[PDB]
Every structure is written in C-alpha cells, then in structure tokens.
Amino acid sequence: MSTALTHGLIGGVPLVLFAVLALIFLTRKGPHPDTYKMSDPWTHAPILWAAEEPREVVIGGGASGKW
Amino acid sequence: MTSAVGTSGTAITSRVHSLNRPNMVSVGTIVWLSSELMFFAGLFAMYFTARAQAGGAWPPEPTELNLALAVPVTLVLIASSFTCQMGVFAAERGDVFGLRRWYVITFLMGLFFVLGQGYEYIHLVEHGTTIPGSAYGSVFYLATGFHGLHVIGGLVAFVLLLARTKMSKFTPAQATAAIVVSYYWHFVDIVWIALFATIYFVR
Amino acid sequence: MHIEARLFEILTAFFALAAVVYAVLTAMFATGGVEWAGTTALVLTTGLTLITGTFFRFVARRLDTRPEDYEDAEISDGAGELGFFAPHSWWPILISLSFSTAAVGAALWLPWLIAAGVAFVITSVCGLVFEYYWGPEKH
Amino acid sequence: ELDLPYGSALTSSGRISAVTEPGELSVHYPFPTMDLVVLDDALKYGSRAAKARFAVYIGPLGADTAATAREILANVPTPENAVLLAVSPDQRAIEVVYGADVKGRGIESAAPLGVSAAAASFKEGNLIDGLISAVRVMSAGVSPA
Amino acid sequence: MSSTQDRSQLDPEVERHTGVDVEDVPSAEWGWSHMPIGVMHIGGLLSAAFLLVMMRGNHVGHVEDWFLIGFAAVIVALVGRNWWLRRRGWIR
Amino acid sequence: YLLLTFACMNDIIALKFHISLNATTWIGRIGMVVLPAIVYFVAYRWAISLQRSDREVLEHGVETGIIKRLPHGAYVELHQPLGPVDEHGHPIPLEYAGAPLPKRMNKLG
Amino acid sequence: ELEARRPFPERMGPKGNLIYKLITTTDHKLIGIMYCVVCFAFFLVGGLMALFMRTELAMPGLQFLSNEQFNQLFTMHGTVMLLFYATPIVFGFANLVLPLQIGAPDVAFPRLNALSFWLFLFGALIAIAGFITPGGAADFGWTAYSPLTDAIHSPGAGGDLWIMGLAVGGLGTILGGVNMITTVVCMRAPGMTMFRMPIFTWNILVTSILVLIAFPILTAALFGLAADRHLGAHIYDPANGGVLLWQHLFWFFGHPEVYIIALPFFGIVSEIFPVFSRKPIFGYTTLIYATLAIAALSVAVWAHHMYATGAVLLPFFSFMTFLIAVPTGIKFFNWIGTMWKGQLTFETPMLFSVGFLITFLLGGLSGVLLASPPLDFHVTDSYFVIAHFHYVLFGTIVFATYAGIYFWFPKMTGRLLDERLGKLHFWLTFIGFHTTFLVQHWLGDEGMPRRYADYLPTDGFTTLNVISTVGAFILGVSMLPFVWNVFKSWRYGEPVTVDDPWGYGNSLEWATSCPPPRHNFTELPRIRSERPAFELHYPHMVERMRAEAHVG
Numbered sequence A: 001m002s003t004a005l006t007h008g009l010i011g012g013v014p015l016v017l018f019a020v021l022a023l024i025f026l027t028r029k030g031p032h033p034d035t036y037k038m039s040d041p042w043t044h045a046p047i048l049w050a051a052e053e054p055r056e057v058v059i060g061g062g063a064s065g066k067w
Numbered sequence B: 001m002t003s004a005v006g007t008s009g010t011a012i013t014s015r016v017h018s019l020n021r022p023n024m025v026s027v028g029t030i031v032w033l034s035s036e037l038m039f040f041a042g043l044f045a046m047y048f049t050a051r052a053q054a055g056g057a058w059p060p061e062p063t064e065l066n067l068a069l070a071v072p073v074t075l076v077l078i079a080s081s082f083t084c085q086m087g088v089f090a091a092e093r094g095d096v097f098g099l100r101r102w103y104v105i106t107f108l109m110g111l112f113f114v115l116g117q118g119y120e121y122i123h124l125v126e127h128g129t130t131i132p133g134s135a136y137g138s139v140f141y142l143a144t145g146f147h148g149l150h151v152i153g154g155l156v157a158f159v160l161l162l163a164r165t166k167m168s169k170f171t172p173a174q175a176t177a178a179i180v181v182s183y184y185w186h187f188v189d190i191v192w193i194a195l196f197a198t199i200y201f202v203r
Numbered sequence C: 001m002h003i004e005a006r007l008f009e010i011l012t013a014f015f016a017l018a019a020v021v022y023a024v025l026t027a028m029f030a031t032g033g034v035e036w037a038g039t040t041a042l043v044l045t046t047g048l049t050l051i052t053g054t055f056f057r058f059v060a061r062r063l064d065t066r067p068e069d070y071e072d073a074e075i076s077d078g079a080g081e082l083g084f085f086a087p088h089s090w091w092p093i094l095i096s097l098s099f100s101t102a103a104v105g106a107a108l109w110l111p112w113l114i115a116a117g118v119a120f121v122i123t124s125v126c127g128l129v130f131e132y133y134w135g136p137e138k139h
Numbered sequence D: 001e002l003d004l005p006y007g008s009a010l011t012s013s014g015r016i017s018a019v020t021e022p023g024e025l026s027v028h029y030p031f032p033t034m035d036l037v038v039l040d041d042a043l044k045y046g047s048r049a050a051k052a053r054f055a056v057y058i059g060p061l062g063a064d065t066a067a068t069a070r071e072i073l074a075n076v077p078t079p080e081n082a083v084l085l086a087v088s089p090d091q092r093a094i095e096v097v098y099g100a101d102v103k104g105r106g107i108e109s110a111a112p113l114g115v116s117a118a119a120a121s122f123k124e125g126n127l128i129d130g131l132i133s134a135v136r137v138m139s140a141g142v143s144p145a
Numbered sequence E: 001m002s003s004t005q006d007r008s009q010l011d012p013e014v015e016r017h018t019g020v021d022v023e024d025v026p027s028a029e030w031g032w033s034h035m036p037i038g039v040m041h042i043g044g045l046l047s048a049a050f051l052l053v054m055m056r057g058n059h060v061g062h063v064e065d066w067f068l069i070g071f072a073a074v075i076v077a078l079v080g081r082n083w084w085l086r087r088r089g090w091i092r
Numbered sequence F: 001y002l003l004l005t006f007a008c009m010n011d012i013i014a015l016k017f018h019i020s021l022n023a024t025t026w027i028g029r030i031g032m033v034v035l036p037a038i039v040y041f042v043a044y045r046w047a048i049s050l051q052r053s054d055r056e057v058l059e060h061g062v063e064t065g066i067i068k069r070l071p072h073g074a075y076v077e078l079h080q081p082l083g084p085v086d087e088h089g090h091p092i093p094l095e096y097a098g099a100p101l102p103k104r105m106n107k108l109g
Numbered sequence G: 001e002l003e004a005r006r007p008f009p010e011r012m013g014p015k016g017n018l019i020y021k022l023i024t025t026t027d028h029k030l031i032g033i034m035y036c037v038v039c040f041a042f043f044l045v046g047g048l049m050a051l052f053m054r055t056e057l058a059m060p061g062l063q064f065l066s067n068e069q070f071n072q073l074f075t076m077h078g079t080v081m082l083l084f085y086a087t088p089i090v091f092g093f094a095n096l097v098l099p100l101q102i103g104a105p106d107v108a109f110p111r112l113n114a115l116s117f118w119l120f121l122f123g124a125l126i127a128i129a130g131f132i133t134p135g136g137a138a139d140f141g142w143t144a145y146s147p148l149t150d151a152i153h154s155p156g157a158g159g160d161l162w163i164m165g166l167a168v169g170g171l172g173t174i175l176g177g178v179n180m181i182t183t184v185v186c187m188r189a190p191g192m193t194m195f196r197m198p199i200f201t202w203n204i205l206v207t208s209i210l211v212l213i214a215f216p217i218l219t220a221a222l223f224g225l226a227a228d229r230h231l232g233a234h235i236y237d238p239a240n241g242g243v244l245l246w247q248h249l250f251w252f253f254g255h256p257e258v259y260i261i262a263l264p265f266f267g268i269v270s271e272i273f274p275v276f277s278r279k280p281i282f283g284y285t286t287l288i289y290a291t292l293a294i295a296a297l298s299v300a301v302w303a304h305h306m307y308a309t310g311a312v313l314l315p316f317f318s319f320m321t322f323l324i325a326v327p328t329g330i331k332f333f334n335w336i337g338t339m340w341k342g343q344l345t346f347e348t349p350m351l352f353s354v355g356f357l358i359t360f361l362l363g364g365l366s367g368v369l370l371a372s373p374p375l376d377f378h379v380t381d382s383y384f385v386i387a388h389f390h391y392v393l394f395g396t397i398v399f400a401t402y403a404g405i406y407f408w409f410p411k412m413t414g415r416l417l418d419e420r421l422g423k424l425h426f427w428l429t430f431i432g433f434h435t436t437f438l439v440q441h442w443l444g445d446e447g448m449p450r451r452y453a454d455y456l457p458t459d460g461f462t463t464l465n466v467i468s469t470v471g472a473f474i475l476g477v478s479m480l481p482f483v484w485n486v487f488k489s490w491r492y493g494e495p496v497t498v499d500d501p502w503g504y505g506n507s508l509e510w511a512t513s514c515p516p517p518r519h520n521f522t523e524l525p526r527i528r529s530e531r532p533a534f535e536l537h538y539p540h541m542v543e544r545m546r547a548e549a550h551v552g
C-alpha cells in the first residue's frame, strides 16, 4: 500500500542495510599488514624483488647515499 | 629434431594402458551407453502408456503392422552384431584389414537395416498411419524412428572410424576406438531386440 | 578395481527392488493399473546400473589388483607412462556451434537448418575425431 | 635442517610445501598492496626499455656495504645485466650496484642521480615511493642494447 | 621429428623503436602491431556519441532509447575506465 | 560486412527466426556501431594469443601424451621439441620465422 | 639463501593469453573457471529476472510489467537458476578440483569437457534467446506440464527455443557426467583406493551417476515434446495418456536433477568443515554410504511432486520421500559432529557453510513437513513450496557455491579474497535471504499460490509481499560485494606463495601450488588416509591422527 512507501522501502532498506553492514565490516582493519614506518627498525625478513624482465656474478659498478 | 623426447609408438597412446589397467574410452562409452539406455527408457515410457489407453483391438485400423519385413531386418541386424564382434576379434589381433572387412559388411547390412526401416516407414505411411494421424502411429514412428537416428549415427561412427583406419597406423588406441564403436553398436542392436520384442511380438 | 562393481551392484539391487515393488504396488493399489511410465523407467535404470556394474565386474575379474587401487601402495609402484590426453583443441567449440545450429533448426522448425546443422555436426565431429590422426601432407 | 616452524614439509622432491593459518597471509610484505604494484609496474612495464633485471633489496646489509650488495647481486637470476638497488633502513645506506654487461649504457650518470632521486624521497619517509622514483630514473637512464 | 627449422630474413621495421615491445605482443617486428590508443579511445567515444545521436529520427518506441543509452553508457564506461587506468598507470 | 548483409535479409530473418522486425533492424543499427568494436577487441587479442600459442611451441616442445616422473608423483606432458635439444628436459628454443609451426605430433612423422 | 621473487604477481596477465586459450581449452582448470564465470553471469541474469518479478509482486496491480512477461519471467528464471546455473556448477566445481582431488593429471576426456562446457553455453544462449522473440520465451512454468506445452497451447517460438536449449544443455551435462565418472573410476592417484578419496569427488561420482539416470529422460521427454509440437505427434496428448506421461518421467528427471544439484554442494560443505574444524570429517565412511543412501532413492522417489494430481501411488512415494529425508539427515548430523569439539574459525567459506547449514535445516524441515500428502494437499504450488525450494536450494547451490568459491579461489587463481568484503557478502546474503523467504512460508500457508502475476487488495497479505521484496532487493545488492571481491581478487588482491592458504587443508588437492601447474602436480604425497595433504603438511600428527580416530 501507499506506493511511495513500498517503493522507498524496497529501494532504501537494501541500501540502508548495505550502508550499515558495509560501515561495520569494511571499517575493520584488514588482514594486510601495516605500511612500514621508516623510523621503526627493519623487523621484516630480508626482501629481494627481482624482475623476470628478460625471461630465460662478476662485478659491474657502484653508487651510494645516506638519505 | 635430435631424435624425439616423446619416443612412443605413435602420437596417440592407448588410453592409459590395458594389461593391468582398465581401458578408459571403454568405461566412457559404457556409462554413456547406460545414459542412452535411460533415453530409451523415456521412449519406452512414451510407448507403454498410450498402449494402456487404447482398448479392445488397440493397434488401430490403418496399421497393418508388417512383421514379414520386420523380422528379416532384425535378423540382418543381429547377424550384423556377430559380424561386428568378429570385427573386434580381428581388432584385438592387430590387423586393420580384418577390422575393415567385417566393419564394411557391418556398415553395409546396417545400411540395409536403415533402408529396410525406411521402406517400412514409406510402406506404413502411404496406406496407413502418420505421426499426426494416430497415437500408436506416432509412438511407433518415434520409438523406432529415433532408434533409426541412433543406428544412422552408429553408421556415421562406422564410416568415420573406417576413414580413421585409413589415415593412421593401427595403434592399441585405435583398437580401443574399434571396440568402443563395436559395442556402442552392439548396444544399438540389443535395444532393437528390446524394441522388436515390444512393438511387434509382445504388443 | 573392485569397488565400482560393488557400488553399482548396490545400485542394481536397490533399483531392481524399487522397480519390482513399484510394478507390483501399482498393479494393485492404483486407480487404473500399472503406471507404465515410472515402472519402465525404473526397469531401465536397473538396466543402466546393470550395464555399468556388469562391465566393471567384467573388468574387475579380468584384472589383478591395480597398482592404483591397492591399499598401501607407494607412488613409485604405479609411476609409468599414462595414455594420450588431448592438448589444445578448437573442435569442441565447433561441435557446440554445429549442434546449436541443428537445435535452433529443430526449435524454429526450419528443415534446411536441421539438415545444415546435422551436416555441420558430421563435419565438426569428423574434425574432432580425426584431429590426432591426420598424417602429414603428402604433397 | 629446519623447515618453516609449523605446518611445512618438503615434498617427494625439493619443493617445500608450506601452509598459512586461515586468517593470515603468505607474503607479509610491510607495504601496501597497491603501491608495490606501482613498484612492479615501474620495474617491469616501464623498465623493459632498459634490458636489465632491476633488482631491489630492502634487507639489512650490516657489513662493508658495497661488497655485501654486489655479493647479493650474484643471486639476481641473471647477474651480468642487473641494476640492483639495496636500501637498509636499519643503517640508512643506499647502494646501487650494477651487473657486468650493463656498463656504459647510460648508467654512470644514472646511478648517483638514481641514488639522489631515491634519497630525496627516503628522507620524507616513503620507502616504496623512493624505490619507484629510483627505478623510473634508472629506467630512463639505462639505454637498451 | 620429420621437420626442418625455419629461417626468414624479412625487411624488419617507425623502425623497431616506437610501438609495442616484442614481449607485449610476441611478434611486433613481423608486421604492424600497435594501433595508437587515442584512436581507439576517441573511436569508442565517437561510437557512443553516434549511438546517442541515433535517437534523432522517425521514432515512437522509447523502449529503444534505453538500449541506446545502455550501449552508449557501456562504451563510455569502458572508454572512461580505460583512459583513467592509463592516466593512473593501471591502478584499481 | 556480415552485419550489413545479415541485416539486409532483415525481413526474412525476422520471418523465420521469429524476431520483431523492428528489433532486428535495431540490432543491425546498433550492431554496425558496436560489433566492429567487439570484433576489433576479439580479433586483436585473438591474433596476439594465436601468436603466443605458437611462440610457446618453440620455448617448449609439441604436446603429446603424459608420462609420470618415476621416483615421485609428477605429471609432465612429454613435450616433443622442434629444434636442437640440450642435455636436459628443455631444448634450445628456436626463433620465430613467419611459418606455421606444427602443434600436433600427429602432423609430424 | 634468499629467493628472487616479484614484489606482486602478474596482475592481469600478458595481452592475449586467454582468448585463444578460451577457444582451445583442454585442461579441466580453465574450463571450470569458465563454468564459474559464465554461470555467475547467468546467476546475475536470473537474479535481475527475479527482481523484475519481485518489483511486480510488491503491489497488487500489474504496475510494472504484464501478465505474459511475468509468465516468461519465472520460467526463464527457474531454468537459468536450475538448469543453467546449478546443473552446470555441479560439474564446474568438478572441473575445478576433482582431478586435483583424485590425483588426475587432467580430466579423463579433456576435449569432451570443453565440449560439455561449450554445449552448455550454447544451449543456455539458445534458451535465453526466447526473449529476442516477440511473443517472448516460455510462459508455461519450469515444470512445463504437457497440455500447456503442446503446440495448441503456448504456441510461440520461445517455448521451442526453450525445448531445444535444454536439449543441448542436457547433452552437455550428460557428457560432463561421463567424463567425471571416468575420472573418478579410472584416472586416479596410485596410492588412494576407493575409500580414501575425498568426499567431494565421491559426491560427484554418484552425482554423475544420477545425471546419466535423469537427464536423458529430459532429452527423451523433450524430443517427444518437440515432436508433439512440430509434427503434432500425439504423445503428450491430454485425452491420451499424456499428462501423466509428462509428469511421471519429467519429475523422474526433475527430482534426480535437484539431487544432482544437492549432492556435490554437500560435498563442498563436507570439504569445508575438516579444514576449519581442524579435525577429521566426522563419520567419513558414514557419508560415503549416505550419499548412495540418498541418491539411489532419489531415482525411486520421483512422484512426490504429483500429490495434487491424485493419480500417483500415494503412500509409496510419501514413505520413500521420508526415507530420502533420513540419509541427508545422516549426512547432516555427521557435519554437526564434524564441527563438534573442534577449533573453529569462521573465516569466510566456513561462514557460508554455516549459513547453508541453517537454511538447509529449516528448509529440510519444510521438506518432511511438505512430503506428507495431506499436508501437501493445500501446499502443492503454494508459496510454501517456493520458499521451500528456495530455502533449501538457494542454501545448497548459492551458499555452498560461495563456500566453494571462497575456498577453492586461492587454489584456482593463486590469490586470496578480501575477508572483510566476503563477510559483508555473507551477512547481507543471509539477512536478505531470510527476509525474503522466512515470510513466504506464512505467505503460502495463508493463500497465495505459485506463479501468479498479481493479487488483490481485498485479498490480504500485501505486507508479506513487500517484505519479501525488501529482502529480495537486499539479495539483489548482495553480489555487488561478490563481483567486486572477485574483480579485485583476480587482477589485484592478496597473493599466496606457499600452499594451504586455508591452513590444515586436506583431501589431496592442497598438496600442490596455488596456481597449480599444467597437469596439476609436481609432487604427489604418499596417500595413506582420507587426508593426505594434512598428512604431508603435518607428519608428526599422523600417530595422533590415527590413535584417536575410532572412539568418538
């Protein structure tokens, strides 16, 4: 009855309930770890990020810096 | 090339193995045979009712149901079962020519079954029932006519496997293909023994 | 193997039991008579499991214990060469297009499209089944 | 010999199959899952116009830093053309070290400029953005061959 | 195993510098292999503009204009998503 | 071309394949604008994937039936190489030459 | 001492590695991924079709769409939820993980699985193709009773396209049945006998058995119906025996079709439990018998749908429908024993498993409440039966398919999902689904029978239709988190390097890489019991695994 009510109900209560559950479940902290704070020491295991860029020991060069 | 890395008897292998291993296209066509038996169960249930309905002398007046042309083509088809089984006996022992002779004559008298069934359909529609004409005429034309489609598909499998025997070396995989088409078509003419007992003898 | 024969023997025992009890309980107890439409469906589902279980029993008697099927079998006891599986193949998509053309000829009752779709079914089924048997071009 | 301390076991060959407790993860990289995608884009997509596997090392190197960076260039999976960057936030040391065949390919002026373009972003406090602004610079510097 | 190797020296070529690298498409030197991508962006956007111009005509069935709005909004959404991802470098 | 033709028998298509005639000429009228874009996408990426399908038949071999590895449980497809082989399970990968490379050991000897 | 990995894996993949590989699929993996993709696309099509029906039922007028479009709407909807969403996915999870579970390199007939998938898709498109037709698709229901389907009645082209679309889809699913039963029979790892296979490949063994039993009678019924429409061929003629000739063998397809729907999702959920209960599946041989104890009787139970016709042997089918309700109760109490005294964590696929448990519970209580014919003589074709088959069937396929996707997702694409977004997905596919079907029990018990396009304001019960509409549109916005989750979990999302992204994995699947190699296995484990991945990953566990595996 009262077609504004039975259209606004079926069009809003899904979106109201979607907003409520998406603001109580997606505002949690996910399983992904936090970004690395630079001031904190390096607690992680050592990381090498290779490239696989052309697919298939002696020294080449050097450079350095101190931030 | 150097020699090969897939140093086998052919590019095609058996299906797994068959000395201490079940043949896998064999069990594949066995369970698909069983599915098509349930398809024929659908056709049999379309027959065994609409015969409980019609009472009295129930095969109707335009259906002079010819048995004198039915039982020769059933005898042709079930002797052709033994020709096809002799073909698979000549397929186990590996010669293509013993396979091809018995499957050529199996294809020829299976084609003779299809042409005899087609002449029975012509001779039974031109002075009798049509598929919109009767209940019994319609169920006779579908319970055995789509069996005509089964046996014409089996004939397509025969001519197709014979071209396959023409184009490659006789592997044990091709004996697997031969035994698979062999008892697919044996299933076809054991279902036709069931249909010929049902339609003509038992009624 | 052994246990597929026992499995479809269990299915055969139950399907035959249900078929004969449905036939003899719709012989009486029904309005007109035997239903003839689930009765023969039960008799031929007994036939289905007869075919599968009888073939699996034929195989299981004409066989030793399979090195696959054997309880307490190391992987090196059954590590040989399996048979041919097909690699990449563009014929099943053509099987489906052919059988769908035949089906939409049998739906929209177009006998030209029935005959053409059946011709494409024969052509594509040949292309599937000969795919690993075409020899090289003899020139 | 020790595997991963719970749940892993080496298989019938040398591949060590491990586990992951069901809510937890596998990699545990302490960086967001979107900016290291930008790192992989700057290190694969916008790197292939340099023809060198740009390695990036973030672990500790608490020794003679050049020698312990050119020692861990030797396991970059083709060490003759690889431009490794090593950064140690325990130690505050950038170290860009080359492979052999990368030599005079626009690279001797790109390594200190790559260190400067990295360390201008490390002192802000962005590890990943520092690595991205270094690898983009060394991609613009190293010329292909 | 009954095969020989194949060796073809073509006339290889813009000359092998600008376009697509040989690892994006596995054979870029063997033929023309990269449309410039503003052409396909403006081609999609002009396709959707043409579908929106197609309302103007002999027309009483407005059930069609929802198909034209739909197939124009799909193309505008794909072009806008694709241009936005190249503006941010394929992110999200 | 196939669209402008297959919406020129617009009449008899909507006759036999029971479609509203207005609907199939709108299908054509949108199809000549969107179906070249769809077939451009499918054609371009399908040509690139046909390239990649015969640029992995060089880096690997030609595919056949499966052998298991002996002491452990593996499944390799037993690739048959086209060029010279190295001492181990991988050959020397050939270069492309604009030729139709055979993808079935069937079509080999 | 340290590896050399990419920082993130390949996001999309190279340009052009899939679309020809679409056309020339031969591994089970990519075919199963295609099943899950295109059948969730048909699930989307059906869901919007249901939302059209449910906009229509929100008010007693015919305010939104017509009568005839509604009668097309529930029919095409019932098919692309049963015969084009459920029926494919019961082999789609087979092509996902059954050769992974039995140690098979590929599925047994690796072109005929592509043939199964492509026949499915091109039966599905030519059955949806009734909507292009001007009179539309089939106005008669999914049940499709024969004095309504013979060409005097519903004479349009859409019913014919429906018929031959189910012909092609049935043939493709028969072919999925044969190649799955031949995998599980004779393409299997060398250490596992019949009994230490997983329960899921067991359910697909018996499911493919019942596919071969059921679906050729769908094609036989339906070739008879296509002949009776086009040739005018008197088989399903009503003054002949041909209105129980439809009902007997169509429901002899239909109820074995809904148990080939129900059984491999029982297998999914029975695989979900032992890796989140951190323990055995309780009574494994009890399930391995109970699948047969439900599925053999599934064939012989078929006429519990024609209680209203008054023409079936009534105590026989009522007794055997109670007797098919008991072994699924066994299969259920084994699951309650499987969660029993375990260390549960409700990460998302087990959360969908528990949602399935609750829905299938009270739906099956409506099953035993509905299979008694005097309690069905008012309820046949009411909304109690439609909330019954939703509150069962949705619970089986939809909840256990979301358990199957959120479980076998990191092993079929090598990347996890968002756990928060999956929990969002669950709670508003749980709250919304109960909102739209806990009230249709009370809406079919007081009168509103099935397949109506409108009702009256002088009839009551408008508020229960509007609360079903509220719930159905909660469920309509429920897969925005699901398609967003898989859309940002393929091309992005949290990767896995090591095996078992769900710890304490088992069932011989989880002993290979999370993108599994082509032909599935670099190292098979020594199979000893039902959980050989759990025995690879936990070797010290084995004596504790067997020393207390018998008491209870």
Ligand code: HEA
Binding pocket: G143, G258, G259, G261, G262, G304, G305, G306, G321, G322, G324, G325, G326, G328, G329, G330, G332, G333, G361, G363, G364, G365, G366, G367, G368, G370, G371, G372, G376, G379, G380, G381, G382, G385, G388, G389, G392, G393, G394, G396
């Ligand atoms: C996934 C599919 C599915 C499943 C699994 C079911 C499972 C059941 N269904 Fe449902 N059903 C349908 C999909 C399903 N149904 C469909 C599609 C239709 C027809 C569509 C139409 O006609 O419109 C349908 C029509 C239908 C009818 C048709 C009558 C009518 O049209 O009104 C009946 C009644 O006989 C019915 C009864 C059952 C029963 C008894 C089960 C049983 O298997 C359920 C048993 C489960 C519980 C009983 C076990 C757990 C509970 C306890 C823990 C233990 C047991 C306790 C008891 C002993 C009290 N179903």
Ligand code: HEA
Binding pocket: G041, G043, G044, G045, G046, G047, G048, G049, G050, G051, G053, G054, G074, G075, G077, G078, G079, G081, G082, G086, G140, G141, G142, G143, G386, G389, G390, G393, G394, G397, G398, G436, G449, G450, G451, G452, G472, G475, G476, G477, G479
């Ligand atoms: C297989 C289980 C199943 C599923 C999943 C469905 C999906 C739904 N069904 Fe359907 N339903 C049946 C089993 C199912 N149904 C059966 C057996 C019939 C009977 C056929 C007959 O009677 O003949 C039926 C017909 C039916 C009726 C008809 C009865 C009548 O006419 O009175 C009703 C009642 O309202 C109904 C309720 C729902 C609801 C609320 C869903 C929800 O799950 C809704 C799902 C759809 C949305 C979730 C998708 C979201 C929308 C998209 C986001 C839009 C955009 C997508 C495009 C881009 C592609 N269903």
Ligand SMILES: CCCCCCCCCCCCCCCC(=O)O[C@H](COC(=O)CCCCCCC[C@@H](C)CCCCCCCCC)COP(=O)(O)O[C@H]1[C@H](O)[C@H](O)[C@H](O)[C@@H](O)[C@@H]1O
Binding pocket: E061, E062, E063, E064, E067, F002, F003, F006, F020, F021, F022, F023, F024, F026, F027, F028, F030, F031, F034, F035, F038, G131, G132, G134
């Ligand atoms: C070989 C396989 C080919 C498969 C192709 C499958 C087709 C794809 C989908 C098609 C959807 C069609 C829906 C049409 C349904 C419909 O009838 O809608 C009509 C008009 O809609 C439309 O056409 C709009 C839809 C347009 C579709 C978009 C095109 C997509 C492209 C990509 C497809 C081209 C494919 C061509 C293939 C060629 C070969 C190429 C290789 C409304 O006009 P009308 O019905 O006359 O008037 C009404 C009164 O009747 C009614 O009483 C009154 O109520 C009013 O409504 C009034 O307006």
Ligand SMILES: [Cu+2]
Binding pocket: G254, G255, G258, G304, G305
């Ligand atoms: Cu039922």
Ligand SMILES: [Cu+2]
Binding pocket: G305, G306, G308, G380, G381
């Ligand atoms: Cu009813």
